Symmetry: C2
Subunit: 55 residues, 2 copies
DNA sequence: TGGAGATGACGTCATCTCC
DNA sequence: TGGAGATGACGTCATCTCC
């Protein structure tokens, strides 16, 4: 009966919502990570720049 | 009547969903941007590294 | 104040994409 | 194949957070 097609999907719907919230969270975390790897890489270049050649 | 509290919220609900999809999209785009700024900054350091001092 | 609007999380339906 | 499961987008309800 209808009942069971609905039951089985309410749950496929619940798992699905949970994956989406773990996707959003990873992105939020990675933007943040790449933003800090960048500050250090842009300092590194500044440092080596004021130095290459020998001064 | 109830009717109108529901009407007004169905719409606050529609705007809200649209903001969320523009949030997800910006993150997707920025992870990507910071990943390419990084490849170039890690090449830059490699280049200047094999050079500082003079060789 | 209390009153409005924004948002989580639900359940549903219609559509896709697979073995 | 067709049959199951994953997903968009809806509408709703209960809760928050503000001026």
């Amino acid at each position: 009966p209808a009942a069971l097609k609905r039951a089985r999907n309410t749950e496929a719907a619940r798992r699905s919502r949970a994956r989406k919230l773990q996707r959003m969270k990873q992105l939020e975390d990675k933007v943040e990570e790449l933003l800090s790897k960048n500050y250090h890489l842009e300092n590194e270049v500044a440092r080596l720049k004021k130095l290459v050649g020998e001064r």
